[PDB]
Structures are given as C-alpha cells and as structure tokens.
DNA sequence: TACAGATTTTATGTTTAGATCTTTTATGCTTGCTTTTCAAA
DNA sequence: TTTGAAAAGCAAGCATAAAAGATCTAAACATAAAATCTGTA
C-alpha cells in the first residue's frame, strides 16, 4: 500500500481552460475564450510593469550600496530593514581584488567555522581569478606574497537579528587583528531588520567604539517613502484605465491588509490585485464588454441582469420623476478620468511641491469617497492650490458591472481567512457544513466531532475524561443506535456484538475515543501526563 | 543471505540483487531499484540473523526503518517476492512460525536417530534421558545436550 | 582544484579487494589448497639490534638466579592439559570443527598450557597419528583494529593480503563451501577474547559460527578472563555457540607455586660456584662459594602469593626481587662494580613482599609543606562540621583564615602569619589567598589526593578527598603544630 | 596481451543534526487559613 | 442598609515536569591511495 509509505510517484492515465460558462450555463464558448484572452492580456500587461519595477528597485539598491561602499578601521554599513536578498556586486579595482564574503547564522555556529568558511571563500575566489594554504587568517597576512595584488574584503552578514551576538562580536574582534597589515581593507555590511538599538545593546562597548570610526546607516525597505508601492498601484490603475473601476471598500481593504504586513507588503499588494482580477474575470459575464469589439451578441440574459442595477434604477426613477440595449452600449465610450486625476495630483505633489512621502493608495481612497481636502490639509503647503487639485467623483450608470469590489467576503476568505475561527464555527454549528436532506439517525444524532465540541466548549479548562465520556453518552440515543447497527444483517460479528447487553457502552466509548484522538491530532486537547491518560486540558477557546 | 556478513544493513537489497544475477551491474541503494528489477518477472530470499538489520542508536521509528521496507515490498501487488525471515527471539503483517524449544522425548528421538548410523550405542538410554531432562525447560538448547554427551 | 582540507599523511596498505569466492569459476573448480605453495604458510628484523661488546660483564652468583626466575625461561597443569589435548586431538582426527573455551585469572598458565598442547599436537602430527594442521595465534590486544584478526587469519591460511571485509568473506567462503578433502585443519588460538568484543559483536559471532559449519575443519581455542564473559557481554547466539563445557584455570595453591619455583631453581639451588674475589664473576661447576635459597622463604612467598592471586608471575617476581635485594647488599658490602655461603634469606623475601604493601600516601603527606597541611586540616574540619564529603574552596579559604586568626597566640602561627599573608614583606599587601595557595592546590591535585570540579568560579567550586579520611588524619596527627590546635 | 585513464573500494577526517541521561529549578496539587464582594432580607 | 456565606487569595510543603547542558553518536560532507574495470590498441 502506497498510502502506508512516505513518498510515492504516480503517473495518471489520459484518454482546455479552467473558465466556466456563466449566465447559469447560457453563455457561449466564444465569450469564455474571449474572457480568457482578455484576462491574460490584462494580467501580462500588469505583471510586465511589475517586473520592470522589481528590476529597477534591485538595480537602485545595488547602486546605493555600491555608492556607500566605495564613497585602519572597518567600513561599516547598516542596511536597516533588509531581508538579505540583495546581490551585492563589486567593481574590479585595478591591482586589487575585491572579494564578497556572505555569512548566514546557519553558517556561523562559532567563530572558527566563520573564519574557515570566510578563508575558503577568499582562497577560492582568488584562485578562480588569478599548492594550498591553511584556511586561517595567516592567508590574509601572506595575500600579497601569494597573489601579488592587495585585498579588499566585503563581509555581508545575512540576518543579523538571528545570529548569536557573542559569536559575531568575537568574529569582529578577530577581524580587527587584520588592521596591522598594510595591504588589507575590510568592509562590513549588517542587514538589520529590527532597528539599531537592539544591536547596540547586544554587542560590547569596545565593539561599538570600534565600529563607530567609519559607519553609515541606510534605511532601505519597501515602506521607505512609499515610492515602489505607488508605482505598482499606478501600473495596476493604468492596466484597468478606461475599462474597470476600483471600489472604495476594495482600496480600504488593500490599505488595511497592507498595514498588517511590513517587510513583504509589495508582493502582498500584487497578490491581492491579482486575485481581484482573477475573481472579476471568473465571475462576471460582462467582462467581455470592456472592449468595444464584443458588443455584438448581448442576449436576453445580459439585458435581464443589467436591469437589476441600483444606478440604473436611480436613473430611471429620476427620469420618471422629471418626465435599452443601445442606451447600454452608450455607457462605454466615457473616460472616468479619476486615474488621470490621481496621477496628475501625484505628479504635482512630486515635482512641484517636492513632496514624496505620500501614499497613492490612500490618496485614491480619499479621491473615491471625496475627502481629498482632509488628506491634503496635512502638509500645510497646498492651501492655495487645493481648489484646482480637487475634482468631484463622477457617478456613472452601470459602473458596478465593471468593478473590483469587496462585499461578499471572498477576498478575506481566500487570502486572509479566520482559520482558527473557521474551524471553531464549523465544529460548533455543523448544520452550515453538512446538508440537511442511517435515514433516521442523521436527523436526531449529531456527528461525533460536532457533538463532542459542544461539551468541549461548555466544560472547564481541565476535563476528567470519564465524566466527559458520560456526558457524551447521555447525548446519544441507545435504541436508535442499536436499531441502526442492526440494519445490515450481512456482518455476523456486528450482530453478535449488538445483542450483547453492554453494546451501547462499547459503541459510544469507541466513537468517543476516535473523536478524542481526532481532537488530539487537530490540537484542541492535550494530556496532563505522559504515562497516564486520565485528565485532559483544552488549548482552544472559541472567538479568540 | 546471512546478515552478519553484511557491512551495512541498508545494503541488503544489493545483496539481494547480487545473489540472483550473473551481465549488467546497477547500483541498488533503496528498495525501489529492487522493485523495478524484480518487476518485469518468482524470487525467495531467506534472511537469516535478520536482527542485525535493525539500526543501533536510532529512534524506534528509524531503527525499524529498513526492515519494514523489506516487509512492505513483500506486501506489494505484481511483484514476485517471497521473504522468509529467520530471527532469534532472545535477541529481539507477515505470517509467524515459531520453533518451540525441544523437550526430553524429542531430544531422545533426535539423539537415537542421529547416532543410528553408528553400529554400537555407547550410551545407556537412561543416561540420555537424564541428560535430555537436565537440558530442558525454558531455553532448551540441543547444542547444550550435544556438549553434555561429548563431555561425558 | 582548491581543497577544503588535506590528508597529507595517508598510509595505505597494498591489500587487494577481490575475495576468495570470485577467483574460481565454481565450487568444483577449486584445486587442492594443501598442494599449493602460498597456502598454509608453505623474520628479517633480527639483525638490527646487535652490536659488538668490548667489556667482559661481571655476572655474580645471584645473576643466574635472577635470569632463572624470568617468565620467558608444567608440574601443576595436567588435567587442563589432558582436557584440551583430548578435545583438540579428537577434533583433528575426526576432521571436526569445535570450540574449546578456557578462562582464568592472570598468570595461571593458560597460554603456556595451550601452547604446550599445540606443540604436542604438532609432535603427534610429525610422526603421523593425526592429519597435518595449521596453527594460528591471534591476540586481541596486539591488534590495532579489532577487524585486523580477519586480515591476520586469512593471511595465515592463503598467504594473500586483503582488506578486512574481503578477508571476512574469503574466510566465510573457505569455511562454508570448500570441501574437507580439499583443505587442511586449522587450529586458531584467540587470546585476550574480551579485546575482540565490539559493539555489534560481528567478529565474535563470525568466529564461533564458523565452528558450527560442516566443511570448516576449524578448531577455535578461546582464552578469556572469566567464565561468565559470554553470559555478560555476548548475545545468546554466541553464548549458545561457545557451549556449556567451559574450562576453568583456577589459581595456583602454595604447593604448586613452590613446585614451579623449585623446578626453576632445580640445578642451581644448594650448588657450588667458582667466584673471583677481586671482581665477583661466578662460574658454575678464586673461592668455591655455596649458593642456596631457603625453602622456608620460597614456601611463605608461595603461601602469600597463592592467598592473594595464585599468579605464577607474581611468585617468580617476588623471588627475583628478593634475589635482587640480596645481590644489592652483597655488591654493596663487597665493593663490586659493573663491567663462603651465599643465601637468599627469608628477610629478603619479606622485604620484597612488603615493598608493594607499604603506603607512601601518609609518608607523602607527612613531608608536605605547612600550607598544604593547613589546606588538608581545614578541609578535614569542614568535613567534620558540615559532613558533606565535598567542600567549596571559598569555605576552605575562610576556614584557613579562621584557623589562623583564632590561634593567634600560638608561637608558630605568630611567626608564620606574615609569611602566609604578606610573604614576610612590607610593601606587599594583605592577600586574600595564602602564599602558595594554587601551588599546593595543584600539588594535591597532581598527586591524586584531591578531586576538583570543573568550574570557573573559584569560590563555589567544590573539592573532594580522593583518599580515605583516617590516613589523612593520621598524617595530620604526626605534625607538632596541627596537633596542638 | 597490454597500458592509460575512469571508476570503485577502503579508509580516514570535518561538520552538522539530533538523541539520551543527569542535575537543579519551576510548577502544580493539597490543606489550612483569611479576605471580600454578592444574592437575599 | 445590612448580612452571612461562598468565591477567591496567601502560604508551606512535597511530588514532579522541565530546562539546561554534558556526553555521545549517526549522518552528511570531504579527501584520497590502491585496486579494479573499461576501452581501445
Ligand atoms: N604451570 C606452570 N609451570 C611453570 N611456569 C608457569 C606455569 N604457569 C605459569 N607459569 C609461568 O608464568 C608465566 C605466565 O603464564 P601465562 O602467560 O601462561 O599466563 P596466563 O594464565 O595466560 O595469563 P594472562 O591472562 O595474564 O595472559 C609463564 O610464562 C611461566 O613463566
Ligand atoms: Mg596469556
């Protein structure tokens, strides 16, 4: 049995797009193929600009690291908020070899391993460009005697917050011994993810005095000044300009979920925008109508479901208070210039007022509701240019058929679910999971996990297991269970066990114990012993 | 295949392979290569002293590790594999056969049948029964009986 | 290619890897290994330790006695000899494979009896009552690695040099598959069997499982320390295969040790020598000097050694030490250097026997300095008050300080307090430790008097006495100063 | 045959991941006693 | 407005889990000389 094994490879037999037919199965296959192609031409258009933004931020980070690095002590650079993913490339200084040595806390169990890995890397690089030596600091001593050139070592410490600071400290005083050699220049790069006050209290004061003689802070992250982010958001807006609308609830959900992630918020933003575009091109049959080519096959179902619109209902109520398909086509040529307004406001903030620290997503939020003035009042420099920079949000009929919105709770169920709470509400309720349609037992007897979770919830923090078994046993009908266990006459041992007078005390106990070990596997309960199984204590409370 | 002559317990599949072929020589380091070698074809391996195949200084799970890989391939469909694993009880699902330690009458029958080749029986019968009774009970060894008669 | 480390001192033997099972086409194609030149054994270093002597060295009367009592140069082993010879002769004659288990205490003549059995079997095979056999001797303590036995025995059988795994499979194939008419009987002595015990017991099981094979013709004589070595350190398979009939070598009685020593000194006791009085050289048949060693001295040495161990080495060494003591006194009184009745008396035997019985622990602690004695005395006071058997070093420091400051009217303490706390000097401050504190601490740790815990805090590190408390007190009771306080 | 190169075997050193046992310290149950708000008059 | 009374807090003591680490080993990683296998020649 391969299910009783660790890993097995199988090759399925074989005797094509995942998009389904909408409009309750009435949509044609050509609309499905068109919706597939339109989703891919928007998706590729967004992600190409994402690729160019990622390449640009990597290249600019390399450029500023090189500028800080090349402008009888260390040259120290603290990269604050660094996730240790940067490739630090070094120029080929003439008559001198520049060597990069990277160190991981897994590669740093002690000072000896740090030096041996560093010196092996140095000797490997020096032989790869230009008899063996001892992997030791005497190679730094005899580097000019063995290679002719002099040396410039750049140490990049990946993930300094996770390293043992005693080992790093002793490695720093060990590297300090190379200052008495005339041909040696040493630079250190510390990738700090918390702040500098955590690392100045873990090193010794002599180490701090050693590192103070030549050091540069550089706070480089994704939240630094909001530049990279706003570029991704503007790329997404330029992808959907003229075809799609962003709801204010969608933008505020983006702001709320991007507030809760600091180190990796950019690809989170890309992920939420990607799943929103996937949701729109999977749900809406009007997704083919974002270009004017596909307006030639609007059927009765399209006119039926575009008539259930609040904006259209408000518009026709206004017309009947004052006073179909061609009129619906007429609402496609309009511009909706809010994206151009947002990029014009961003350019006016950037290169007129020299304001860079603004969030374009929150600016788009305040433009979507209409509270741009309260957002622009904070800088105290747009007092006289606020009227020209303000424009009213226009209302367009049938906007909600072309709209990325968040009203159903889909985007907070697939990307940021209430996982523990979902398990708890599935276990406690259980009629919201299983359908209400053993024909008699399913209407009176609960599933064993759901029935056990009720007495789990209403008990105390430490539970005696036998009284918990008794409280499980009082919730079960013994006569209906014995009738259901006698339904199949083809099993002899079941029938000879059922007529035994303690059959229900066997059945309820073993269903109870399989539910107890299921609860132990999920992690709801634990045992307050190792050799005994007499008392449990619970670790999971609902609602937290 | 006796298992003390193995170097590593993980090499037994290779010892299974080299016991059958001449030809080509392919490296066997898991049971999968053995399974694909025996797949296009039956084969009986008799693993004596299989208690050596347990790994020392390894957690219960990893210690039993190789042996069930010896056994679960013996419970696979479309492979022609029969495993007969003889092991000593004192030192330590497949079908289990137990060899009970001999009693006095069985040892008497073994001794008389085994020196039935000799023309003249130099032992008295009650001496053989006394030696068999003294070499009996729990852990009844026929080697002990042979040593007792040789010492006599 | 840049190497992550180098092994520049590799010394690899020229030993081949192909075993014996793959050098012939089949079992029926193997030739007669008895009629082969390299099989069954069919010294180059002895010249290197010879020089020219240019002095006539003077050998006194006791020199022949001391050379006579050496272990290198069997009245009491006749039943063990008979049992081992009968078992080995019956196994050689019947082409059988067997195990002979022998165990005993050191020096009771196990190796000597096994070698005499083997020499008598070779003498019997020389005049053709038994088939010819090979003799292999493997000592477990003379192996660098335990698997070298595999490399040794096969090299004695085939003359080939292989690696240990290949040798093991070669021996397995030779013992199991080669027919008995095609091979020769091999008798292997396994000396110091406890040194061939590994964690997995591969070698023990292999050596005693080859004896259970039909075609093996292998006789294994296993020599060990104790009877219950298989029942303690071996599995039930090896204990079953070794067997139940195990041969005890009990210690010698005093009559047997006396007979061994008298059989050594048979030709030179109560004898006459020509001794030149100017130089002392003695020649067996200028003064005719009669040499004797008394039977009462030998008797009581045999009684003491037989009560202690039964070791023939110990009895021979006690007699040799008595002869050495007598020769030292003789060469002292006669002015004899190195180039009418001489008796090895009973007092020399009793001087030899008590020399390993006098204890230098009390003598060593009696002649220590005052500060080391003060350390030991303060440690004894701490063991008296708190009763811990392990005292902190800071407690010893404060107890030494307290013992100094309480007995401040004692004349010796008044004379020596400035020495302990200022080294007799102004411009040296009052010290927190006494002078030579770590010196006497390391001195008592070097002697094995103390045990010190491995801690880096000097105060709460504990120190334990490694010797008994009454000999320490006894040594403290000899001193005139520490008796008074 | 036959020799040069490639691969395997056997042997040893280097470093990491993890198990097992021992010792000292935290924690939880038990029993007794005292404080303090809570449903009822 | 009281009022007694049960929920809750404090403390000592002992059994026991658990952290910290001393000691050790298996396995991954690494090198390397002699034997052995191909592979043409
Ligand atoms: N029966 C004996 N007769 C004479 N000399 C003996 C006798 N037994 C022992 N010796 C002497 O004692 C020496 C030590 O004996 P032997 O080497 O046989 O000891 P052993 O019992 O094998 O001890 P160990 O366990 O230390 O190897 C011998 O070399 C010999 O000089
Ligand atoms: Mg010996």
Give C188's strand partners. Answer: C136, C220
Give every CB contact of residue A314 below 8 A, 6+ residues apart in sequence: none
Angle value at C-alpha A141, between A140 and A145, nearest 5 degrees: 100
Q: Which helix (H) or strand (E) holds A404?
A: strand A403-404
C313 is in an annotated binding site: yes
Place of tokens 């030579």: C436
Rounded (10°) angle between helices A478-485 and A503-522? 90
**In ligand 1, which atom is closest to the CA atom of C263?**
4
Q: How far apart are CA C387 and CA A531, in angstroms?
A: 39
Q: How would you write chain C as a 3-class SS string?
A: CCCCCCCCCCCCCCCECCCHHHCCCCHHHCCCHHHCCCHHHCCCCCCCCCCCCCCCCCCCHHHHHHHHCCCCCCCCCCHHHHHHHHHHHHHHHCCCCEEEEEEECCCCCHHHHHHHHHHHHHHHHHCCCCCCEEEEEEEHHHCCCCCHHHHHHHHHHCCCCECHHHHHHHHHHHHHCCCHHHCCEEEEEEECHHHHCCCCCHHHHHHHHHHHCCCCCEEEEEEECCCCHHHHHCCHHHHHHHCCCEEEECCCCHHHHHHHHHHHCCCCCCEEEEECCCCCCEEECCEEEEEEECHHHHHHHHHHHHHHCCCHHHHHHHHHHHHHHHHHHHHHHHCCCCCCEEEECHHHHHHHHHHCCCCHHHHHHHCCCHHHHHHHHHHHHHHHHCCCCCEEHHHHHHHHHHHHHHCCCCHHHHHHHHHHHHCCCCCCCCCCCCCCHHHHHHHHHHCCCEEECCCCCCCCCEEEECCCHHHHHHHHHHCHHHHHC
B70: left (phi over 0), alpha (psi -120 to 50) or beta: alpha
What is the least distance, in Å, from the CA of A93 to any CA of chain B? Answer: 50
**What does the H/E/C string look like for chain B?**
CECCCCCCHHHHHHHHHHCCCCCCCCCCCCHHHHHHHHCCCCEEEEEECHHHHCCCCCCHHHHHHHHHHHHHHHHCCCCCEEEEEECCCCCCCCCCCCCCCCCHHHHHHHHHHHCCCCCCCCCCHHHHHHHHHHCCCCCCCHHHHHHHHHHC
Answer yes or no: are the C-beta atoms of A391 and A340 closer than 8 Å. Answer: no
**How far does the CA of C150 sit from the C1' of D10, in Å?**
15
Helix (H) or strand (E) holding A150: strand A150-157
* Cβ neighbour number for residue C324 with a 10 Å cutoff: 18
Do the Cβ atoms of C392 and C461 come closer than 8 Å? yes
C-alpha–C-alpha distance, residues C79 and C74, integer Å: 11
Any residues with CB less than 8 A from the CB of C340 and at least 6 apart, and which? C287, C288, C289, C290
- A401: closest CA among A303, A507, A516, A514? A303
Resolution in A: 2.7
Q: CB contact, 8 Å: C26 with chain B? A: no
User: How far lies B127's CA from each of B116, B117, B130, C386, C485, in Å?
Assistant: 17, 19, 5, 68, 78
CA nearest C261: which of C290, C301, C288? C301
* CA distances, C47 to each of A238, C52, C53, C54 (Å): 99, 12, 15, 19
Nearest residue (CA) to ligand 1, atom 30: C71
The nucleotide closest to C13 (CA, C1' atoms): E34
Q: Is C408 annotated as a binding residue?
A: no
Q: Which of helix, strand or coil describes residue A430?
A: coil
Give strand pairing partners of A76.
Answer: A188, A215
Q: How far is CA A223 from the centre of its chain?
A: 15
Q: How far is the CA of A5 from the C1' of E16 (A)?
A: 39
Distance C71 CA to ligand 1 centre (A): 7
Instruction: Determine the distance between C203 (CA) and D33 (C1') in angstroms.
Output: 71
> C244, C245, C246, C247: best mutation site toward chain B, by most B Cβ within 10 Å?
C244
In angstroms, the Cα distances linking A283 to A42, A271, A288, A305, C262 are: 16, 18, 12, 13, 114
Q: Exposed (0-12), middle (13-18) or buried (19+): which is A472, by Cβ within 10 Å?
A: buried
Residue A263 DSSP class: T
Question: Rounded to an integer, what distance in angstroms lies between the CA atom of residue C464 and that of residue C383?
Answer: 10
Q: What angle do CA A140, A142, A146 make, to 5 degrees?
A: 115
**How far apart are the C-alpha atoms of A196 and A421, rounded to whole Å?**
38
- How buried is residue C303: exposed, middle or buried, by Cβ count under 10 Å (0-12/13-18/19+)? middle
C377 assigned to a ligand binding site: no
**Contact (CB, 8 A) for A51 and A59:** no
SS (H, E, C) A235-251: HHHHHCCCCCEECHHHH
| Ligand at shortest distance from the CA of C247 | 1
Cβ of residue C131 closer than 8 Å to a chain B Cβ? no
CB pair distance less than 8 Å for B141 and C172: no
Return the structure tokens found at A419: 């996982």
Q: Which nucleotide is nearest to A106 (CA to C1')?
A: D16
Q: Please check if C438 is assigned to a binding site.
A: no
User: How many angstroms separate the CA atoms of A47 and B69, rounded?
Assistant: 48
- Closest chain B residue by Cα to residue A7: B32
Contact at 8 Å (CB) between C377 and C403? Answer: yes
C145 CB less than 7 Å from any atom of strand D: yes
Cα–Cα distances in angstroms (integers) from residue C401 to residues A184, B27, C374, C421, C457, in the given order: 55, 75, 10, 10, 20
Compute the nearest-CA separation of A4 from chain B (Å): 9
| Hits for CB < 7 Å against strand D across C residues 16-45 | 17
Question: Do residues C186 and C134 lie in contact, with contact meaning Cβ atoms separated by under 8 Å?
Answer: yes
Note the strand E nucleotides within 7 A of protein beta carbons: 17, 25-27, 30-38
Write the DSSP assignment of A64-117 as a string of letters: HHHHHHH----EEEEEET--S---------TTEEEEEEEE-STT-SSHHHHHHH
How far CA A234 is from CA of A19, A240, A369, C15, in Å, comes to 28, 10, 18, 75
A3 touches chain B (CB under 8 A): no
Q: Which residues contact A213 (CB under 8 A, 6 or more apart)?
A: A73, A74
Contact between A363 and A345 (Cβ < 8 Å): yes
DSSP designation for A171: H
Interface of B with C in 58-77 (CB under 8 A): none
Ligand 1 pocket, Cβ-based, cut-off 6 angstroms? C 71, 74, 76-77, 104, 106-112, 260, 312-313
Partners of A153 in beta bridges: A99, A186
Largest CA distance in chain B: 61
* CA–CA gap between residue C337 and residue C340 (Å, rounded): 20
Q: What angle do CA A455, A459, A460 make, to 5 degrees?
A: 155
Q: Residue B12 CA to D16 C1' — how many Å?
A: 27
């Amino acid at each position: 049995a391969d299910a009783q094994r660790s890993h097995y490879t199988v090759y399925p037999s074989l005797p094509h797009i995942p998009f389904v037919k909408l409009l309750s199965g009435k949509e044609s296959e050509v609309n499905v193929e068109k919706r597939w192609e339109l989703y891919h031409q928007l998706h590729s258009h967004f992600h190409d600009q994402v690729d160019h933004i990622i390449d640009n931020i990597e290249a600019d980070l390399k450029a500023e690291i090189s500028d800080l690095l090349y402008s009888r002590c260390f040259n120290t650079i603290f990269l604050l908020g660094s996730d240790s993913t940067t490739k630090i490339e070094l120029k080929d200084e003439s008559s001198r070899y520049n060597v990069l040595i990277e160190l991981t806390p897994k590669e740093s169990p002690n000072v000896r391993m740090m030096l041996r890995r560093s010196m092996y890397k140095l000797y490997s690089a020096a032989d790869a460009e230009e008899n063996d030596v001892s992997y030791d600091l005497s190679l730094v001593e005899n580097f000019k005697r063995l290679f002719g050139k002099d040396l410039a070592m750049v140490f990049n410490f990946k993930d300094v917050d996770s390293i043992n600071f005693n080992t790093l400290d002793n490695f720093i005083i060990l590297l300090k011994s190379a200052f008495k050699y005339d041909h040696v220049k040493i630079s250190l790069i510390f990738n700090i993810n918390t702040n500098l006050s955590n690392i100045e209290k873990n090193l010794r004061q002599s180490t701090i005095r050693l590192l103070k003689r030549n050091y540069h802070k550089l706070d480089v992250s994704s939240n630094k000044g909001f530049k990279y982010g706003n570029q991704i958001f503007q790329s997404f807006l330029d992808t959907v300009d003229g075809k799609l609308n962003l709801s204010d609830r969608f933008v505020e959900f983006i702001l709320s979920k991007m507030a809760n992630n600091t180190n990796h918020n950019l690809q989170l933003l890309t992920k939420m925008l990607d799943y929103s575009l996937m949701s729109y091109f999977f749900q809406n049959a009007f997704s083919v109508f974002i270009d004017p080519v596909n307006v030639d096959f609007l059927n009765d179902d399209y006119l039926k479901i575009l008539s259930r619109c609040p904006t259209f209902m408000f518009f026709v109520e206004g017309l009947i208070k004052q006073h179909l398909e061609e009129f619906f086509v007429e609402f496609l040529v309009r511009e909706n210039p809010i994206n151009g307004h947002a990029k014009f406001v961003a350019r006016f903030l950037e290169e007129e007022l020299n304001i860079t620290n603004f969030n374009l997503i929150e600016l788009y939020h305040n433009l979507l509701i209409g509270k741009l003035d309260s957002y622009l009042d904070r800088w105290s420099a747009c007092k006289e240019y606020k009227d020209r920079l303000h424009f009213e949000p226009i209302d367009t009929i049938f906007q909600e058929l072309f709209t990325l919105d968040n009203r159903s709770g889909l985007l907070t169920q697939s990307i940021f679910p209430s996982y523990k709470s979902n398990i708890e509400d599935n276990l406690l309720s259980w009629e919201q999971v299983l359908p209400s349609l053993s024909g008699d037992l399913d209407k009176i007897m609960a599933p064993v996990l759901g029935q056990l979770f009720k007495l789990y919830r209403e008990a105390n923090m430490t539970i005696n297991i036998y009284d918990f078994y008794i409280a499980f046993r009082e919730t079960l009908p013994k006569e209906e269970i014995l009738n259901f266990i006698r339904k199949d006459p083809s099993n002899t041992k079941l029938l000879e066990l059922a007529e035994t007078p303690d059959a229900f005390d066997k059945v309820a106990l073993i269903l109870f114990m399989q539910a107890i070990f299921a609860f132990e596997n999920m992690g709801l309960i634990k045992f307050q012993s190792t050799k005994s199984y007499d008392l449990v204590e619970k670790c999971v409370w609902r609602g937290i | 295949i006796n298992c003390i002559s193995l170097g590593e317990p993980s090499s037994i599949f290779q010892k299974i392979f080299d016991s059958f072929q001449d030809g080509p020589t392919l490296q066997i380091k898991n049971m999968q290569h053995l399974q694909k070698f025996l797949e296009p074809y039956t084969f009986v391996v008799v693993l004596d002293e299989m208690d050596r195949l347990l790994h020392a200084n390894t957690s219960e799970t990893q210690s039993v590790r190789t042996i069930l890989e010896l056994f679960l391939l013996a419970k696979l469909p479309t492979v022609s594999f029969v495993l007969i694993g003889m092991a000593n009880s004192l030192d330590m699902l497949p079908q289990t056969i137990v060899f009970q330690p001999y009693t006095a009458e069985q040892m008497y029958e073994i001794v008389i049948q085994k020196m039935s080749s000799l023309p003249t029986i130099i032992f008295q019968p009650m001496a053989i029964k006394f030696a068999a009774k003294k070499c009996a009970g729990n852990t009844g060894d026929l080697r002990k009986l042979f040593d007792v008669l040789r010492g006599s | 290619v840049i190497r992550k480390f180098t092994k520049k001192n590799v010394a690899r033997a020229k030993k081949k890897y192909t075993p014996f099972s793959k050098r012939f086409k089949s079992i029926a194609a193997i030739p007669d290994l008895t009629s082969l030149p390299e099989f069954y054994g069919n010294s180059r270093f002895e010249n290197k330790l010879k020089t020219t002597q240019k002095h006539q060295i003077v050998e006194t009367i006791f020199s022949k006695v001391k050379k006579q009592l050496n272990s290198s140069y069997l009245p009491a082993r006749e039943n063990e000899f008979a049992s081992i010879y009968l078992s080995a002769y019956s196994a050689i004659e019947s082409d059988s494979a067997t195990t002979i288990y022998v165990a005993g205490t050191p020096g009771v003549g196990k190796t000597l009896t096994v070698r005499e059995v083997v020499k008598e079997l070779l003498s019997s095979s020389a005049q053709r009552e038994i088939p010819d056999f090979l003799y292999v001797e493997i000592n477990g303590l003379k192996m660098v690695k335990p698997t070298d036995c595999y490399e040794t025995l096969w090299n004695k059988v085939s003359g080939e040099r292989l690696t240990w795994a290949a040798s093991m499979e070669s021996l397995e194939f030779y013992f199991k598959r080669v027919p008995k008419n095609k091979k020769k009987t091999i008798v292997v002595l396994l000396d110091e069997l406890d040194a061939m015990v590994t964690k997995s017991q591969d070698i023990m099981y292999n050596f005693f499982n080859w004896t259970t094979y039909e075609n093996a013709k292998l006789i294994v004589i296993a020599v060990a320390n104790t009877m219950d070595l298989p029942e303690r350190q071996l599995g039930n398979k090896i204990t079953s295969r070794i067997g139940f009939t195990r041969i005890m070598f009990t210690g010698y009685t005093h009559e047997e040790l006396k007979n061994i020593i008298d059989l050594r000194l048979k030709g030179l006791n109560d004898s006459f020598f020509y001794v030149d009085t100017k130089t002392g050289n003695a020649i067996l048949i200028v003064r005719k000097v009669r040499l004797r060693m008394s039977a009462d001295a030998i008797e009581i040495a045999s009684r003491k050694v037989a009560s202690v161990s039964g070791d023939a080495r110990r009895a021979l060494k006690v007699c040799k030490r008595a002869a050495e003591i007598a020769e030292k006194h003789y060469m002292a009184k006669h002015g004899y250097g190195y180039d009418g009745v001489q008796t090895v008396h009973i007092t020399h035997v009793m001087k030899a026997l008590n020399e390993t019985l006098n204890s230098h622990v009390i003598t060593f602690m009696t002649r220590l300095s005052f500060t080391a004695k003060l350390f030991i005395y303060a440690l004894l006071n701490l063991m008296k008050k708190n009763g811990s058997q392990e005292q902190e070093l800071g407690d010893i420091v404060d107890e030494i300080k307290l013992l100094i400051e309480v007995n401040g009217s004692n004349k010796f303490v008044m004379e020596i307090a400035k020495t302990l706390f200022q080294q007799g000097s102004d411009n040296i401050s009052e010290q927190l430790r006494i002078i030579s504190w770590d010196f006497v601490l390391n001195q008592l740790l070097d002697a094995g008097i103390l045990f010190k815990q491995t801690m880096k805090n000097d105060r709460i590190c504990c120190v334990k006495l490694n010797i008994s408390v009454e000999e320490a007190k006894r040594a403290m009771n000899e001193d005139e100063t520490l008796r008074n306080l």
